[PDB]
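Deviations from the work plan: none for this task. Representative record:
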Amino acid sequence: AIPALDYNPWEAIQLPTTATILDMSFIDRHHGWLVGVNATLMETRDGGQTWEPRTLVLDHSDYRFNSVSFQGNEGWIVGEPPIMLHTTDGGQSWSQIPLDPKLPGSPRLIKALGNGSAEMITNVGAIYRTKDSGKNWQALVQEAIGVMRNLNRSPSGEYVAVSSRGSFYSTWEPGQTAWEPHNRTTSRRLHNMGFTPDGRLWMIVNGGKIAFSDPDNSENWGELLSPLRRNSVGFLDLAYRTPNEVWLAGGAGALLCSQDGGQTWQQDVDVKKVPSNFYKILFFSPDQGFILGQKGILLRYVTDLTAA
Amino acid sequence: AIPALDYNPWEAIQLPTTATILDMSFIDRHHGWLVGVNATLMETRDGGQTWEPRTLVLDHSDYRFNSVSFQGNEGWIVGEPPIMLHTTDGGQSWSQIPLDPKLPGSPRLIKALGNGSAEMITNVGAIYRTKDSGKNWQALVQEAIGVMRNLNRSPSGEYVAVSSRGSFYSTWEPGQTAWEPHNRTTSRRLHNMGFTPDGRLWMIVNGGKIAFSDPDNSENWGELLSPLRRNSVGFLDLAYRTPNEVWLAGGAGALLCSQDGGQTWQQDVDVKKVPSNFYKILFFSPDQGFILGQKGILLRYVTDLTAA
């Protein structure tokens, strides 16, 4: 097979819930928040080593809290059925922000821009901005692209959305008046796309192959690569710890690391029998990162200090 | 209710298995081993933050590895159906030690005494010693007491065994020729017993009460205490982190801490919805400890370094 990874940095944590975790965001290195299914909200004060559940008083518990975002002590959460929560004190207290009921779709993503501003993107790809803590919104992109298979953001605030069926992708950044479609080059269907730290695009396509866009001409693509060299189910997400160190997650404990920017890969065998799919990789710094699993499991990154 | 604990030190880890973990033992602060159901064996090199599964080549996988014990780099494991494994190199390689098939019962506990010696206690309470890496055994206590509800060891090598039905308990230490029975003082049935760091006995009895034997006359007992002040299912284990700091575990995330040697208690609310029973508390030092759960969950102790 491909070589086994030398050191496994990932510790699987079972949170005090059976609900799937959908997002996480940090105020600073120590203080952060995670959100998920069935109105799940938890806090950390030690960088994510331990978590404290927090309950909100609501007439429903059925919310999928899909997105949480902080900029400093200002934080936002959105979910479906439509709900928006806001804090200005690091989540010590949370207020509901009413949403227009004719809002097409449901909130999918919120991004804290600071100073009372946030961008919200719906499940159908409409993009809205508030500058006044959600009291008034204006459409940045009013034409919906329909259900997105995946949605990711670049370091500079561009987004990439994979089409429902993975037949194409679209991009958007401030200044543009609608999503910009792009043809896929591969004969295979797209599963996920996002950005590298240098602002190139990456893609995961069906059947376990990946590729990277060409530096400074993102309409052309590099050659497909098979990280497992072999016929695999497929991968779910790709994320960078450092410019050279890339992780690739998928179902059933499948987790690979590359040390050369995604050219070659090694398998982290130690996590293979963790009883979870690994869906979404969130690095906050080179020594702080998480992988969201199912049913309250996540993985937490542990720097190797055995030779310290 | 009783007060909520101030800081929760326990992080729940999901190991790379669904098998229940039954014991753990450390070579030193960094290097240790855990064992459990369905021939589960895992190693750590970072004090238990991460674990590496290890597979043995065997004609069966049905073993409940019930006990692992190291003294330095010498280690032993025992399980049921009868099996004994031995290592002299810190578990880099493990050898099977054949057991006499007429051995009554199945091995329950092994204790590494160093220099090739170990004490083994069966499920029916017979006690055997080897001085020659298990090539020859001699009975220390040949008369079986039958199925023990629980079995624990003192800092000086005494054992206490609760009777099958919890109607009485017995003790044994070197020099004695059989288990020594004792009457219980309580009208309630015994669930678990063990030793305090000062060598007194403690007991957990049915209905959520505990008590401690009288210093330097262990045949008399102090007053029953209700840690929850309230009618509870019951507790499963009690263990000391320090002479004054005691933990009490039970079913369904129930976990209490005392800071005054077990007189008064606070509940660790943050772990209540971890989806596991907490069965067995193992402290290795004041900053290193674990609680064994079900289906590959354990809790790991995290010292509070937020003010560091």
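Residues 160 and 171 of chain B are 4 Å apart (CA to CA).
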